[PDB]
Amino acid sequence: ANATKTVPQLSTITPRFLLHLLSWVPVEAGIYRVNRVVNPYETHPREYTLRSISTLLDVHTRVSDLYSSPHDQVTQQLRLTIETIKERQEYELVNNPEYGLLAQATPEQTIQTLAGAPTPDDLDALITKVWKTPAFFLTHPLGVAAFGRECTYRGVPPPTVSMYGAQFITWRGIPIVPSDKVPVEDGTTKFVLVRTGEERQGVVGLFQPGLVGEQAPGLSVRFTGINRSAIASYLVTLYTSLAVLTDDALAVLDGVAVDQFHEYQ
Amino acid sequence: ANATKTVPQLSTITPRFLLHLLSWVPVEAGIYRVNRVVNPYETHPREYTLRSISTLLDVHTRVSDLYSSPHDQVTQQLRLTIETIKERQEYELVNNPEYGLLAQATPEQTIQTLAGAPTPDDLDALITKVWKTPAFFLTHPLGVAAFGRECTYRGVPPPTVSMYGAQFITWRGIPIVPSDKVPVEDGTTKFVLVRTGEERQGVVGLFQPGLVGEQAPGLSVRFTGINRSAIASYLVTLYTSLAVLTDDALAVLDGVAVDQFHEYQ
Amino acid sequence: ANATKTVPQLSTITPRFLLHLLSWVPVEAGIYRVNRVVNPYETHPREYTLRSISTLLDVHTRVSDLYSSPHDQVTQQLRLTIETIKERQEYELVNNPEYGLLAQATPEQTIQTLAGAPTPDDLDALITKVWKTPAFFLTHPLGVAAFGRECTYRGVPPPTVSMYGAQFITWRGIPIVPSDKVPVEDGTTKFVLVRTGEERQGVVGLFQPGLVGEQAPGLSVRFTGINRSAIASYLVTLYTSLAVLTDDALAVLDGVAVDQFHEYQ
Amino acid sequence: ANATKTVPQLSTITPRFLLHLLSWVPVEAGIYRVNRVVNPYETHPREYTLRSISTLLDVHTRVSDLYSSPHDQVTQQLRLTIETIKERQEYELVNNPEYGLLAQATPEQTIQTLAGAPTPDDLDALITKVWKTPAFFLTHPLGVAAFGRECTYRGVPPPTVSMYGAQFITWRGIPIVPSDKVPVEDGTTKFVLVRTGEERQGVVGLFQPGLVGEQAPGLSVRFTGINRSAIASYLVTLYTSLAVLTDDALAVLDGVAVDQFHEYQ
């Protein structure tokens, strides 16, 4: 007879902690200006214009024998499209060549590991670079494991904190947050220390309010007509950028090896 | 069309934890007398007269294409001037040759590191000198990193405390507070242990109330007329001093090396 | 350019407090049996079979220049259809000739007003009939006004309670809940005193779980194919009944006049 | 010597409880459409376009011997101008011929006093007209006194509630809020019963976001250049409208006499 079903399951849905850890500022015309005092009063402006993350969704008048209605098919496919768009937004916030965290860090704010593996000394140096209220560490889960191994070899157990239904390792009270959008190439990842906030001259994400078909901040769903085959189309858009108000709000630890192990017994 | 703007960003704005950790006593005529019992009853007085931290701000009838009004230009420039005056006040509280913390410490209250780097033994000795209710440690962020390294080598992880939106390392329950106004010369910094309070014979900051154009405790903004070029001027003033009620309320650890590392692997 | 719009507004949407005041029991096959001890042990069963509240919704491939998408048209029309179905459910719970509250009350549990208008004495008599934990009074808003008038003439102000975002007059601590589904004919309404609950032998509503296209308890939305004109149809169904476990859980005050006024001045 | 001064005092500043009791909806292009189901599904739209409350403020290069700076003169005069603009907004929300509360009430929702003075029976009738979650009563303070007198003659003391630093008489749990913008002509005022909220089909105020020189919701301050006499000008603007989503969200009691007294002794 009847079978109890589920909504479709997507394996690429991640918790996306970075989208909750950041502070989000609305930009009412897509342009953000940061005025920074040049001799630290004259100011030099830096401009941030929001960029589009977009996807076109074509819903068919086809069978799809898991939905039982055209209404449920459109609902589920819109939900999956929105989840994918938000995963892409997180990836872009870390990895964009223009406004990504890894790109907006300066050479004076970037340091290297002393001996490859991420040790407590390297995280201490990172804290020295962002000593004014660091908010979180950002790295790949492999990097979290490597740091935990190095801490265990030194006989130091770091505590954990509870946040967003997750458990986070903290170093000097600062959470270490895992993100799979942080690249791992040749066995090396990065550690990123970030201070967030506009009223403390930190790092803020940017979104555009008041769009057509708005569902989430900056997220727009709009119906782009009907073709000859009765295949309705929807355009889902997310205008995104990231702003660093002061340069000392962001530091990057480079050359973090994630495949080093200690001997015992 | 329109662009969303920011108030100007100053990179030299620090959290200024010392201005919140200290206790502030009002001085109604700029003179503070501390009567201390000579044989520990005859008393010998020590006098503290408030000194001026001042700056003259000239606002122009110029373009400044980031403000959109002469009213917004004056507001932002007054805000930045006040932030700079408070940073200077913190620097003077640490570094003044007359009433600074580093200057008012006695030779009997000043000790040296056993082997250069700041170890738990040195902080323990500092605590022995201020054993009656120490309030906080004060040092440069580099010194915080060096202490953390020495603690990690010894296998001892110090806990952290939450205060003023920050995370502080504590040794024996006493926060270690970072301050960039603590000097670092030749790779050596200082550690300062302080007990604050007037009702416990500690260290108190001094300010003058009831001034012309008062905005913050001891802070005065006054309009010094108009010149021929319609360039209005404002004088911003802060009368400040620091008092140590008892000598054992303040100790300094000297010769703290901040560039020593241990070998591993 | 753009205009900020609203979802459609329906004037017949009522708060439906009765659907929240009642206790709801699931019936897994549409049949409910109440076994009641005949001599108060032999038992005589009373059977309750759930009845269907249904409506067929035809969504068109028409213009409807307030929706901007066929998806938004279907969403809003389904929402309005569900609100109408729940209003009909409340009406049926009060007014059904088989399982309505007014029909299931016995002649021994039904009393009349002493002199037409609803006075505190009549509500006291109603409480005597349901003295074992009465839960709420149910009447038309006109009846609430008439009771308030009679209370004011007697010099007795009844207190109010806060519940479901509303303010309710209480008599002897029992809320008086307004419902427009309570009939008013010839200027006369009814007052209903009800004890709800299955574990206290009260009044429970009945619904069927595990249906096709379930959204709310007992509420099913199903897609009934496509016709030649591409007019999709949805069937929305609600199987409902009401059970009184013991006869003394329900009393009705009859002949309540709502248009009587006192003279003053 | 010095004298302690005050910011200027304006006697027309009222608490403006109505601006806090209402729910405010942003309109991103100045047009609001309310779609209401005609047969209670076809819909008939009602359009609300925001109207401007504006004032031009000319600040002089004059003496004004109470300010001590041109900066303090502009600050205080802008503050007073904004207070006056908000008082005008409250007046317009009550009294506008197009979107005022008194104008948007329908003849079927408007009732008259039984014998002139506002008695508990009249307020009960008003509650019958807005029985679905009334939020507050709105009237002149003279009307509040008249209602209190009529309640005292009947031997009924109404309780009070604490809200926005004020004490409000409640009838049937609904606050009676005083407003001097409610007219009193020929000794007669009005009582207004209002349900507020967009998600309960009530009454919402409308404002425009994202304006030039925004300080408060919908409030814009902009600098309109400099004339020959160096008299700078500012334009302060407030775009405002009021929307009633359902007709039964608003009722008005007419012909309320406020000068009737009872004899005693």
H/E/C letters for each residue in A36-50?
EECCCCCEEEEEEEC
Asked if D115 and C264 count as a contact pair (C-beta separation under 8 A), the reply is yes
Pairing of strands C203-207, C23-26: parallel
Q: Give me the residue from C69, C70, C223 closest to A69, CB to CB.
A: C223
Sign for the pseudo-dihedral over CA of D178, D182, D184, D190: negative
- The pairing of strands B136-139 and B174-178 is parallel
- Phi then psi for residue C85, to 5 deg, are -65, -35
Exp. method: cryo-EM
Whole-number Å distance between alpha carbons of D72 and B221: 11
What contacts C192, CB < 8 A, 6 or more positions away?
C101, C102, C105, C137, C138, C139, C182, C250, C251, C252, C253
- For residues D180, D182, D183, D187, the Cα torsion angle rounded to the nearest 10 degrees is -80
**B63, B69, B229: best to mutate for the D interface, most D CBs within 10 A:** B69
Residues C142-170, buried b or exposed e (16+ Cβ, 10 A)?
Answer: bbbbbbbbbbbbeeebbebeeeeebbbbe
Place of tokens 């940017």: A206
The answer to whether C155 faces chain D, any CB pair under 8 Å, is: yes
CA distance linking residue A64 with residue A66, whole number of Å: 6
**Residues A226, A262 contacting (CB under 8 angstroms):** no
* Furthest C-alpha separation in chain D: 76
C223: closest chain A residue by CA: A69
Whole-number Cα distances in Å, D182 to A245, D21, D94, D252: 49, 15, 7, 12
Distance from CA of D85 to the nearest CA of B (A): 20
Rounded Cα distance between D96 and D94, Å, is 6
Q: Return d(Cα B141, Cα B164) in angstroms, integer.
A: 17
Phi, psi at C38, each rounded to 5°: -65, -40
**Burial track D151-168 (b if 16+ CB lie within 10 A, e otherwise):** bebbebebeeeeeeeeeb
Distance CA B156, CA A102 (A): 33
Give Cβ neighbours of residue A175 (< 8 Å, ≥ 6 apart): A136, A137, A161, A163, A168, A169
Report the alpha-carbon angle A223-A226-A228, nearest 5. Answer: 160
Written as one letter, the residue type at D53 is I
CA distance A179 to A194: 14
d(CA C48, CA C242) in angstroms, rounded, equals 8
At a CB cut-off of 8 Å and minimum separation 6, what does C145 contact? C258, D124, D125, D127, D128
Report the alpha-carbon distance of residue C40 to residue A192 in Å, rounded.
76
Q: In this structure, is the dihedral angle defined by the CA atoms of residues B99, B103, B109 and B114, taken in order, positive or negative?
A: positive
Which position has the token pair 């949407």?
C13
Q: Specify whether the CB–CB gap between B123 and B137 falls below 8 A.
A: yes
Is the Cα torsion angle D68, D72, D74, D77 positive or negative in sign? negative
φ, ψ at A9 (rounded to 5°): -105, 125
Residue A78: CB atoms within 10 A of its CB come to 17
d(CA A8, CA C247): 49
Vertex B200, ends B199 and B201: CA angle to 5°? 95
- For residue C95, the tally of other CB atoms under 10 A from its CB is 14
Residue whose C-alpha is closest to residue B160's, from A160, A127, A172, A170: A172
| Half-sphere exposure for D242 (CA within 13 Å, toward CB) | 28
Token pair for A137: 């560490």
Question: What separation in angstroms does the CA of D216 have from each of A1, A159, B100?
Answer: 60, 44, 44
Resolution as reported, in Å: 2.7
First-last CA distance in chain B? 59
Cβ burial of C222 (10 Å; 0-12, 13-18, 19+) is: middle
CA–CA distance, C101 with C242 (Å, rounded to integer): 8
Buried b (16+ CB within 10 A) or exposed e, A220-243: bbebeeeeeeeebebebbbbbbbb
Per-position DSSP letters for chain D, written without gaps between them: ----------TT----THHHHSEEEE-SSSEEEEEEES----EEEEEEE-EEEEEEEEE-SS--TTSSSHHHHHHHHHHHHHHHHHHHHHHHHHH-TTT-HHHH--GGGEEE-SSSS--HHHHHHHHHHT-S---EEEE-HHHHHHHHHHHHHTT-PPPEEEETTEEEEEETTEEEEE-TTS--BTTEEEEEEE-B-TTTT-EEEEE--S-TTB-STTEEEEEEEE-TT--EEEEEEEEEEEEESSGGGEEEEEEEE--------
At residue A33, φ and ψ (nearest 5 deg) are -115, 130
Measuring CA to CA, how many Å separate A70 from each of A142, B104, C47, C223, D41? 42, 80, 39, 8, 21
Round to whole Å and give the CA distance between A22 and A14: 16
Tell me if A250 sits within 8 A of A111, measured CB to CB: no
Which residue of D lies nearest to A208 if distances are taken between CA atoms? D210
Distance from CA of A232 to the nearest CA of C (A): 9
- Alpha carbon distances (Å) from C136 to B37, C176, C242: 77, 6, 16
CA distances from B207 to B51, B102, B214, B218, B222 (A): 10, 20, 12, 5, 17
Question: CA of B138: how far to CAs of A99, B121, B134, B209, C259, in Å?
Answer: 36, 17, 11, 27, 80
CA distance A64 to chain B (A): 46
In this complex, is the C-beta atom of A213 within 8 Å of any C-beta atom belonging to chain C? yes
Q: Dihedral sign, CA of A210, A216, A217, A222?
A: negative
Say which amino acid occupies B213.
G
Element (H, E) at B91: helix B70-95
**Are B178 and B141 spatial neighbours (Cβ–Cβ below 8 Å)?**
yes
Q: How many CA atoms lie within 13 A of B137 on its CB side?
A: 29
Q: CB–CB of B187/B257 below 8 Å?
A: yes
Length of chain A: 265
Mutation test of the interface with chain D: which of A28, A208, A212, choosing the one with the most D Cβ atoms within 10 A? A28
Neighbour subunits, C (≥3 Cβ pairs < 8 A) = A, D
Q: Is C42 exposed, middle or buried (0-12, 13-18, 19+ CB in 10 A)?
A: exposed
Cross-chain residue pair A35–B66, CB shorter than 8 Å: yes
- Chain A neighbours (≥3 Cβ pairs under 8 A) are B, C, D
d(CA B191, CA B256): 7
Q: How far is CA D99 from the centre of its chain?
A: 12
* Angstrom distance (rounded) from CA A36 to CA D28: 31
Q: Are C190 and C102 in contact (CB under 8 A)?
A: yes
Asked whether the beta carbons of D106 and D99 are under 8 A apart, the reply is no
User: What are the residues whose beta carbons fall under 8 Å from the beta carbon of A194, sequence distance 6 or more?
Assistant: A21, A101, A130, A134, A135, A136, A138, A202, A203, A249, A250
C13, D201 Cβ separation under 8 angstroms: yes
Torsion sign over Cα B76, B82, B86, B88? positive
| CB contact at 8 A, C239 and C126 | no
In C166-249, at which residue ranges do the beta strands (DSSP E only) sit? 166-171, 174-178, 188-194, 203-207, 219-226, 232-244
d(CA C166, CA D134): 8
Q: Are strands C136-139 and C174-178 parallel, antiparallel or unpaired?
A: parallel
> Is the separation of the CB atoms in C18 and C177 below 8 Å?
yes
Contact D236, D220 (CB under 8 A): yes
Query: CB atoms < 10 A from the CB of C66, how many?
Result: 16
- Residue D37 exposed, middle or buried by CB count within 10 Å (0-12, 13-18, 19+): middle
What are the structure tokens assigned to D224, written together? Answer: 């309109």
Torsion of CA D44, D50, D51, D55, to 10 degrees: 170
User: CA–CA separation, A203 vs A198, rounded Å?
Assistant: 7
Reading the block at residue B258, the tokens are: 């901040």
Residue A72: strand, helix, or coil: helix
DSSP label at residue A66: T
B66: Cα separation from own chain's centroid: 32
Q: What are the distances in angstroms from CA B254 to CA B35, B118, B124, B130, D47?
A: 29, 10, 14, 15, 75
The owner of tokens 């409880």 is D17
Closest by CA to B129, choosing from B35, B192, B208, is B192
User: Between residues 82 and 101 of chain B, which touch chain D (CB distance below 8 Å)?
Assistant: none
